[PDB]
Amino acid sequence: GMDYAKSDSSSLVTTMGEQFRSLRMLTRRSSPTDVLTGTSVTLPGITIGTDSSLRQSVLNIISYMYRFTKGSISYKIIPKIKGDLYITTSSADNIELNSNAYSFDVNRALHYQNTALNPVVQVSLPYYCPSENLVIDSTSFPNLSNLVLTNLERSSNTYTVLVSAGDDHTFSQLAGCPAFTIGPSRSA
Amino acid sequence: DQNLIESLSREVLLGTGTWQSGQAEISTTLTEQQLITNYEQPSIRQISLPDDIVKGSSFIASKLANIAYMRCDYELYLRVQGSPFLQGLLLLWNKMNADQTSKIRSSITEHLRSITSFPGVTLNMQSDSRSVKLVIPYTSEFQVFNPRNENKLNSVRLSILSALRGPSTSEKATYSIMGRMTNIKLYGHAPSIVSLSYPQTE
Amino acid sequence: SVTNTGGLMPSATISNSEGATMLLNDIPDPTQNVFLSRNVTDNLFEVQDQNLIESLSREVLLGTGTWQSGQAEISTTLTEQQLITNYEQPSIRQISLPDDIVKGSSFIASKLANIAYMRCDYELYLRVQGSPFLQGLLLLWNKMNADQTSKIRSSITEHLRSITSFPGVTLNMQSDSRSVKLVIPYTSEFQVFNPRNENKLNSVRLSILSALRGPSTSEKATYSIMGRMTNIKLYGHAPSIVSLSYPQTE
Amino acid sequence: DEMSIQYLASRPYMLDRYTIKGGNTPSPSGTVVADIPISPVNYSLYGSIIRDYRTIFGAPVSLAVAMASWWRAKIHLNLQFAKTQYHQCRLLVQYLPYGSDVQSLENVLSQIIDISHVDESGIDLCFPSIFTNKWMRSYDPATEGYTAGCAPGRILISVLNPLISASTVNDDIVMMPWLTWENLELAEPGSLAKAAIGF
Amino acid sequence: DDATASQRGIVTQVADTVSSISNVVDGLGVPLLSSISKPIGWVSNVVSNVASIFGF
Amino acid sequence: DDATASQRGIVTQVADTVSSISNVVDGLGVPLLSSISKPIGWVSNVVSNVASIFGF
């Protein structure tokens, strides 16, 4: 080999409060995405990914080095105008145009919450797929479940959302890195 | 003696060609107009799987008659020839499922330092053996596929990683690709016909 | 532990196979950055396994038809003008072997691709149906190699008492099972044949041995033939092409 | 596990090509062929500015350190070539803390490499990281050489005996370093680093 | 061990196991996925057919 | 066992029992109602005449 290397000699506890040796721990941590104004709110599905713009979740950034995903994902939601709201799942087939029907009419799993008491909504979305694996941004399964939320009376509102990997979640197959920016934008 | 599993594992020709100095070498970096437009890095040859084989070989196309679905695990063989005086360096590498994801995610990954971190194998002409082997594990959402339609996934590619050079201008050298299936698992009985996807009704 | 000169003094003793065929003069180098796995778990209902010898033995349809009172019954005897002219006794159906199968079945025609020669042993299945009130009697019998001998020797043998002494099986409609099995051993001068040309030998035949009868005129009844190979032995590797005989030069 | 940091560190990647020429008037001894600052994310030899943003093309470990603020590691190079056995020259490789320019054989750690003895797969070599504290900082403004505390130092490759070659062979050769980061370690997540889609 | 992990009530312990490290390079290595595996704990019930599955 | 089920405080366990499966078709079967039965637990008190029944 012809190494000059001699192995280190340093204590772990002396300088910083923790140490981590995996990327999963960084992903379990929850981070902000983008503000969702209006009635027809659209949270990302478990297929996740493919955001434009430049602001983006940490999970969404780690997402580009891999190819497969599997497992449930978590959401925190903070409504701007306080008051109760409801959470429900749906699918493209599951929708109706009777114009007297509404989102409760399918009997999916439901979640109620008055935000005046508990401002921070916390919802975990499970993993219902036929296949053991999912290529990221797969379109091979059109009817995968997708989240929806409604106040009754169908009034407009904004939400501060922040996603995280579920404890069940993982990535697999290591593709190489995307080009990426690092510093603050130069000039104006 | 002849066997079915044995017959399916037979080696198959896949490609053959000249390679020469004038051809372009892959870029270290990207610029804007090509970054927005999903630019792909140039290559000597690219090869789909497993179609190059199954729909590509009339023999194998016939052996799989009237069977419903199957699994496969590929091997590939690059064999280059040229004079001792020649200089060069090739790369044989496996682009993944690719087509089943977003156009953007198969775009920002094409540059040198990423190309060299995919599964693959390099070939210097300094070597005397002048041949390499590369194994491709099965990988998809679906657990099986019918051989006889467009079940196109993982695209193998061959790329220059150092330009060919010789004492005179316009030197050239030959190469051949070969491949064979292993770990195969056939499954089911059915009429030999193209199948259809979900929105379509049969 | 030695620098590999670009093609000077490679090892000269190497030999190894790649495929089940094709020997190769030198080893590929198993270098690459990663070794990955199979990914998917099966997660499926089980199905019976497929094999080549097993695939070749699958049953095949061969013929199907109506049979009725108006058709002629085979003669007890011969007269001159038909004795001199190599007359053949009339039959409901006749079937060549093994061509009815191999060149007759696109499936089998495909399974035998690129193999040089082979042996086979046939089985046949007759299945007739009609009402309890019907009367009749069929015969299913094996004319031998026939065509490889003189025209005269396949002529003076066609009459009833000879027909009934060939290998074969009768079918009365009195039987409740109403079906019969008949085994054909391989038999030829050559020990093997390529499937894909005119290797025509032993002609199976089906003949009336008693006219069909019912209370009314013009009664009719249905029947089906089926067949399958056994004891097969494939042999050799070759491009899938028609072969040629001795006087011809290729 | 494919998400472990050590798993990311352990994959080699080519960084860039470097010509050495080249039959007739070969470059004079002491001519540098390469200057490689010791950091995965240096803006100099990685990446380029585009829309004010300084994008940086590179290997996955570089992203992994691009996200955390503090880091520490050692280098493991693998030099590799495009040559015949008719080319013939020698090379120096120094490891320079806070320095620049070639610095003799005596002053610093050095490591002569004969070309003719480099069979293929190249030659591995490792360097220790000398520095005033335990943790390096990641991001830097600099558009050329490394700033200060951002990197342990530099590695510098230069000709010792100038190349000679037969008339039967091309004038010049091409060196291609490959590399991996031994004993990588990261701290304090959080940064402006993110994917180049949009701007 | 989520049941015990929630019953004990402390954030830190999160059910201990010791992984089988391999491919050590310089005192650091890569854990096997096979040994990072943790109990799921409803599966035993579904296979053993506990009454609670049927709601009674 | 509702008392223990509430005292232990965890949602999952819901008082275990093992049912006697029958009429298996293909690895799946139908539990007897007789064995899905669970304790009621006030009845013992009413039959044994515990003091709390009388309010004292």
Short mmCIF file of C-alpha atoms in Angstrom, two decimals, chain B:
data_model
loop_
_atom_site.label_atom_id
_atom_site.label_comp_id
_atom_site.label_asym_id
_atom_site.label_seq_id
_atom_site.Cartn_x
_atom_site.Cartn_y
_atom_site.Cartn_z
CA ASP B 1 -28.17 -34.18 -23.41
CA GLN B 2 -30.65 -31.35 -23.96
CA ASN B 3 -32.70 -29.68 -21.23
CA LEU B 4 -35.02 -26.70 -21.09
CA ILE B 5 -33.34 -24.79 -18.28
CA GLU B 6 -30.08 -25.67 -19.94
CA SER B 7 -31.28 -24.49 -23.33
CA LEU B 8 -32.38 -21.15 -21.97
CA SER B 9 -28.97 -20.39 -20.49
CA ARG B 10 -27.14 -20.56 -23.81
CA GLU B 11 -24.94 -17.65 -24.78
CA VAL B 12 -26.19 -15.15 -27.36
CA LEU B 13 -24.57 -12.51 -29.55
CA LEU B 14 -25.83 -8.99 -28.80
CA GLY B 15 -23.68 -6.50 -30.67
CA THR B 16 -20.50 -6.01 -32.66
CA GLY B 17 -18.59 -2.98 -33.91
CA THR B 18 -15.65 -0.76 -34.73
CA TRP B 19 -14.41 1.91 -32.33
CA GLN B 20 -12.20 4.80 -33.27
CA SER B 21 -10.52 8.04 -32.30
CA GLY B 22 -12.97 10.51 -33.78
CA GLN B 23 -15.84 9.61 -31.47
CA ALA B 24 -16.71 11.93 -28.58
CA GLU B 25 -15.69 11.45 -24.96
CA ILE B 26 -18.24 11.88 -22.16
CA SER B 27 -18.45 15.31 -20.49
CA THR B 28 -17.22 16.12 -16.99
CA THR B 29 -19.98 18.67 -16.57
CA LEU B 30 -23.26 20.17 -17.77
CA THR B 31 -24.42 23.59 -18.91
CA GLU B 32 -27.91 25.10 -18.77
CA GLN B 33 -29.50 24.58 -22.13
CA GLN B 34 -28.68 20.90 -21.89
CA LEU B 35 -29.60 20.71 -18.22
CA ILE B 36 -33.16 21.89 -18.75
CA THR B 37 -33.71 19.64 -21.78
CA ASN B 38 -32.94 16.27 -20.19
CA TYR B 39 -29.71 15.76 -22.16
CA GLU B 40 -28.26 12.25 -22.39
CA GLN B 41 -24.55 11.54 -22.40
CA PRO B 42 -23.27 10.10 -25.74
CA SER B 43 -22.39 6.41 -26.03
CA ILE B 44 -20.95 3.91 -28.48
CA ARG B 45 -23.88 1.56 -27.98
CA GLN B 46 -26.86 1.11 -25.72
CA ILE B 47 -28.88 -2.05 -25.19
CA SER B 48 -32.34 -2.72 -23.78
CA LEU B 49 -33.06 -5.75 -21.62
CA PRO B 50 -34.23 -8.34 -21.72
CA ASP B 51 -35.75 -7.68 -25.13
CA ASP B 52 -32.44 -7.65 -26.98
CA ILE B 53 -32.35 -11.32 -26.08
CA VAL B 54 -35.83 -12.76 -25.97
CA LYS B 55 -37.44 -10.84 -28.81
CA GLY B 56 -33.97 -10.56 -30.30
CA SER B 57 -33.20 -14.27 -30.61
CA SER B 58 -35.49 -16.39 -32.76
CA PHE B 59 -34.23 -19.48 -31.00
CA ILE B 60 -35.13 -18.18 -27.55
CA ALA B 61 -38.23 -16.63 -29.04
CA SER B 62 -39.30 -20.13 -29.95
CA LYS B 63 -38.26 -21.94 -26.76
CA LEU B 64 -40.53 -19.74 -24.65
CA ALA B 65 -43.63 -20.49 -26.68
CA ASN B 66 -46.85 -20.77 -24.71
CA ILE B 67 -45.50 -19.93 -21.27
CA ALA B 68 -47.10 -17.17 -19.27
CA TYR B 69 -44.44 -15.35 -17.23
CA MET B 70 -40.80 -15.56 -16.06
CA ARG B 71 -37.74 -14.26 -14.11
CA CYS B 72 -34.15 -13.79 -15.34
CA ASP B 73 -30.65 -12.72 -14.19
CA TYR B 74 -28.27 -11.49 -16.91
CA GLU B 75 -24.57 -11.83 -17.62
CA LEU B 76 -22.68 -9.73 -20.13
CA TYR B 77 -19.34 -10.10 -21.85
CA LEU B 78 -17.29 -7.38 -23.49
CA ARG B 79 -14.42 -8.41 -25.76
CA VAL B 80 -12.24 -5.75 -27.34
CA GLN B 81 -9.27 -6.23 -29.63
CA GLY B 82 -6.48 -3.97 -30.84
CA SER B 83 -2.69 -3.70 -31.11
CA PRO B 84 -0.29 -3.41 -28.14
CA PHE B 85 0.59 0.11 -29.24
CA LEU B 86 -2.98 1.39 -28.73
CA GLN B 87 -4.18 3.51 -25.78
CA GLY B 88 -7.70 3.70 -24.39
CA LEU B 89 -10.25 3.04 -21.65
CA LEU B 90 -13.88 1.90 -21.87
CA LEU B 91 -16.73 1.72 -19.39
CA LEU B 92 -19.61 -0.74 -19.39
CA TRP B 93 -22.39 0.29 -17.04
CA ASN B 94 -25.96 -0.35 -15.98
CA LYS B 95 -28.53 2.42 -16.14
CA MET B 96 -31.36 1.28 -13.85
CA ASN B 97 -35.10 1.04 -14.45
CA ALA B 98 -35.00 4.64 -15.62
CA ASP B 99 -38.07 4.75 -17.84
CA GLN B 100 -40.55 4.03 -15.06
CA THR B 101 -39.71 7.29 -13.30
CA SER B 102 -39.81 11.02 -14.03
CA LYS B 103 -38.00 12.51 -17.01
CA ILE B 104 -36.13 14.84 -14.65
CA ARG B 105 -34.70 12.05 -12.53
CA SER B 106 -33.05 10.40 -15.48
CA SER B 107 -31.46 13.68 -16.46
CA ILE B 108 -29.63 15.25 -13.55
CA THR B 109 -27.70 12.05 -13.02
CA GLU B 110 -25.84 12.06 -16.36
CA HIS B 111 -22.35 13.36 -15.70
CA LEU B 112 -18.95 11.74 -15.25
CA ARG B 113 -18.60 11.46 -11.50
CA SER B 114 -22.07 9.96 -11.30
CA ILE B 115 -21.49 7.66 -14.24
CA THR B 116 -18.51 6.18 -12.49
CA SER B 117 -20.48 5.39 -9.33
CA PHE B 118 -23.14 3.24 -11.02
CA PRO B 119 -22.68 -0.52 -11.14
CA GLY B 120 -20.30 -1.34 -13.97
CA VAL B 121 -16.83 -2.30 -15.07
CA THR B 122 -13.96 -0.52 -16.80
CA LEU B 123 -11.74 -1.93 -19.54
CA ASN B 124 -8.20 -0.73 -20.03
CA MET B 125 -6.44 -2.07 -23.13
CA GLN B 126 -3.35 -2.62 -21.02
CA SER B 127 -4.93 -5.89 -19.90
CA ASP B 128 -3.87 -9.01 -21.75
CA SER B 129 -7.13 -10.88 -21.23
CA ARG B 130 -8.98 -7.96 -22.82
CA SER B 131 -12.43 -9.12 -21.74
CA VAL B 132 -14.87 -8.44 -18.94
CA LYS B 133 -17.89 -9.96 -17.25
CA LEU B 134 -20.80 -8.05 -15.72
CA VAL B 135 -23.73 -9.43 -13.73
CA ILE B 136 -27.24 -7.94 -13.75
CA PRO B 137 -29.66 -8.92 -10.96
CA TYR B 138 -33.38 -8.95 -11.70
CA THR B 139 -35.14 -5.78 -10.57
CA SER B 140 -38.69 -4.49 -11.00
CA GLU B 141 -42.03 -3.71 -9.37
CA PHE B 142 -43.75 -6.68 -10.98
CA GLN B 143 -42.55 -10.09 -9.93
CA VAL B 144 -42.75 -11.58 -13.42
CA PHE B 145 -43.16 -10.52 -17.03
CA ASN B 146 -44.32 -12.12 -20.24
CA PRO B 147 -41.34 -12.24 -22.61
CA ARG B 148 -43.15 -11.34 -25.79
CA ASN B 149 -44.16 -7.71 -25.29
CA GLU B 150 -42.46 -4.40 -24.48
CA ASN B 151 -41.26 -5.26 -21.00
CA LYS B 152 -38.40 -2.84 -21.31
CA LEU B 153 -36.30 -2.08 -18.26
CA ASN B 154 -32.64 -1.49 -17.26
CA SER B 155 -30.72 -0.13 -20.25
CA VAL B 156 -27.10 -1.25 -20.45
CA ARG B 157 -24.70 1.31 -21.91
CA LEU B 158 -21.13 1.45 -23.19
CA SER B 159 -19.19 4.70 -22.95
CA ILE B 160 -15.75 6.04 -23.80
CA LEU B 161 -13.89 7.14 -20.71
CA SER B 162 -10.62 7.88 -22.50
CA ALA B 163 -10.13 8.59 -26.20
CA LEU B 164 -8.42 5.95 -28.34
CA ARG B 165 -4.91 6.91 -29.42
CA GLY B 166 -2.18 5.52 -31.63
CA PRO B 167 1.01 6.82 -33.27
CA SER B 168 -0.91 7.67 -36.41
CA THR B 169 -4.21 9.51 -36.65
CA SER B 170 -7.47 7.58 -37.03
CA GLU B 171 -6.49 4.29 -35.40
CA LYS B 172 -9.33 1.83 -34.80
CA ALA B 173 -10.15 -1.31 -32.80
CA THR B 174 -12.89 -3.94 -32.77
CA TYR B 175 -15.30 -5.13 -30.08
CA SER B 176 -18.07 -7.63 -29.37
CA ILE B 177 -20.87 -7.94 -26.80
CA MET B 178 -22.31 -11.26 -25.64
CA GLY B 179 -24.89 -12.20 -23.03
CA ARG B 180 -26.74 -15.01 -21.27
CA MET B 181 -29.56 -15.58 -18.81
CA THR B 182 -29.22 -17.37 -15.45
CA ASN B 183 -31.44 -18.05 -12.43
CA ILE B 184 -34.43 -18.26 -14.72
CA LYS B 185 -37.89 -19.08 -13.42
CA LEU B 186 -40.71 -19.71 -15.87
CA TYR B 187 -44.27 -19.66 -14.57
CA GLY B 188 -47.70 -20.45 -16.04
CA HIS B 189 -49.30 -21.69 -19.27
CA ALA B 190 -50.90 -19.38 -21.84
CA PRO B 191 -51.48 -18.72 -25.55
CA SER B 192 -48.54 -16.90 -27.11
CA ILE B 193 -49.92 -13.38 -27.48
CA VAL B 194 -49.07 -9.81 -26.46
CA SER B 195 -50.63 -8.85 -23.11
CA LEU B 196 -52.32 -5.59 -22.06
CA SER B 197 -52.02 -2.99 -19.27
CA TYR B 198 -54.55 -1.87 -16.64
CA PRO B 199 -56.60 0.95 -18.21
CA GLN B 200 -57.12 -1.21 -21.29
CA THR B 201 -59.95 -3.74 -21.21
CA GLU B 202 -59.83 -7.17 -22.87
#
